Design a protein around this ligand. Sequence first.
Ligand SMILES: *[C@@H]1O[C@H](CO)[C@@H](O)[C@H](O)[C@H]1NC(C)=O
Lengths: 52, 53, 49, 49, 265, 53, 105
Amino acid sequence: KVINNCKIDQCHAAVTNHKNWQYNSPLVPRNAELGDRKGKIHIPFPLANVTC
Amino acid sequence: NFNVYKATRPYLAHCPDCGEGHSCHSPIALERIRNEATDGTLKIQVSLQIGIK
Amino acid sequence: EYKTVIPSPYVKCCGTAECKDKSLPDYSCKVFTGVYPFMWGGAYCFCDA
Amino acid sequence: ENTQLSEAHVEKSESCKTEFASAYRAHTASASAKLRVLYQGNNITVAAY
Amino acid sequence: SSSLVSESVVSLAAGTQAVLRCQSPRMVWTQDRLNDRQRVVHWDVYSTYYGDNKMERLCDMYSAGDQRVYSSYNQGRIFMPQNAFTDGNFSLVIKDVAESDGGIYSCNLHHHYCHLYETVKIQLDVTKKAKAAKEYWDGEKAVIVALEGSTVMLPCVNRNQIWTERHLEEAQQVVHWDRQLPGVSHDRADRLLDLYASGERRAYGPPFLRDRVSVNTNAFARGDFSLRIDELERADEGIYSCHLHHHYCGLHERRVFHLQVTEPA
Amino acid sequence: TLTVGFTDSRKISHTCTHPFHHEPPVIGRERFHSRPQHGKELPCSTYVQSTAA
Amino acid sequence: TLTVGFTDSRKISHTCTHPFHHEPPVIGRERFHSRPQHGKELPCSTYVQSTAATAEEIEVHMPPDTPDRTLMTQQSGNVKITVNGQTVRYKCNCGGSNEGLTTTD
Ligand SMILES: *[C@@H]1O[C@H](CO)[C@@H](O)[C@H](O)[C@H]1NC(C)=O
């Protein structure tokens, strides 16, 4: 697209990707609608106590 | 040319540590450490041969 | 400084070893039973205990 | 004009299912014991509260 | 709960040290955890065409490797996929087949941890040229009329999760010893003893009954978990259940001993 | 401290680090730093290679 | 601690380690850690690159054996032991040929 007679530094634009989900982290900003969203994954490498 | 090791062979012995905590059998078992030298250089005895084919 | 010499230990199965005195400085010996050592290729021998 | 909202909470760890420290209020106790008795020329073992 | 493998019935008198022989040759849990995920595949050929040719162990593979050649003459003569363990290809390739390499081949695989083995037979007849080079089935194996002076392939199409490359030593043996009294049900037997390959041992019941019922110090290292009960008390009679579980090898064995304790009269 | 690094298909080295004080807890009275060929055995928590939580 | 490691023709890294407390002895009063461009000279024991010793003997003996069962394989209750060109002593609790040293499959 083209917006004529306007400075490039006028504003910003962002690509809105919603295809492959991204797993939550504090650093990443939220999507700004609510807290949680569907899609959950289990964390591997469980814990057990053994002799040493 | 200091060739006395014709019939020698390497080990494959239970090394105390093969890494990651568990102890297994390796060809690089060591059982003798000499550090009497004042300078600080150390002899290290090793299971397997070196400098030969 | 002194060096400690410990030749290859004597292993045995289904039979028992024995200590013969050695006229050497601080020479010592011992025996044990029920040991079931394992090597890289498997158990050294069958006699379980 | 922009703003930031943050929030957080704290929960139990799954590691608790394996490692943890437990506080009890044990007050009293009971006694059990093992005895060896020479009877009719033989050692005999007994267990009782 | 575990699939039955052996049912035993015994009877003795009170005041006797009985022993139940709950053993499994697959329970030789090596002291060694690491490198037990390793399995070893290889190919060995006997040139029975000559009849006096000692079976040539051509080459072998471990987890994460190549073709290693026993003989230099085989070097530049043999290939095994570096991904054989990953995809289970385990297939041999020979670049320069000739009459010297004619014979019956065998693709063999051994698993260190499970101590299980697999093998597939192949036959490789030699033809001077491709005028008769073809595959057929003798009746027990596959026979290839290899074109002399050409590359040939011997397949090993086992693709069982057991041999697929993996970290499999996360699993370890577990042993359950329980007693079902005359009136208790199987899987409701009091949990007398729990044993783990890492030496963890758990006992239950009254403090004393634990000591008489014992297991050797290093059963896992030998795979013999025989349970010794000392000076049998007649109240101990019943059905003793010994469950041995290690899931990677698929082991879910049950052994049972119907021990009836008598008394002097 | 604790840093991680990797090499890109860009043939570039990307690295990050966090200051995290990693102190293995002394298990038993004998403050040991490499486990022995011979010694006692005690329980201790740890992880495993299973990939199904 | 002290570890050693090497890379195989197997393209594998084999490593071992022993806990050995290595503390160079402070020679002289000045506890120095890297020797200087300028300074005094004092005697100190050390080693040398010579490859001809004088009566420091270490014995070598014939290896006892290496009991490996990979040679075995079950053929419908018939154990097959493969030798591939070595001297192998088999011994079984089974009857018949319980014991025997052979060099043939
Ligand atoms: C009883 O215990 C003692 C303790 O040493 C032992 O000497 C003896 O042989 C045992 N048996 C008996 C006294 O019948």
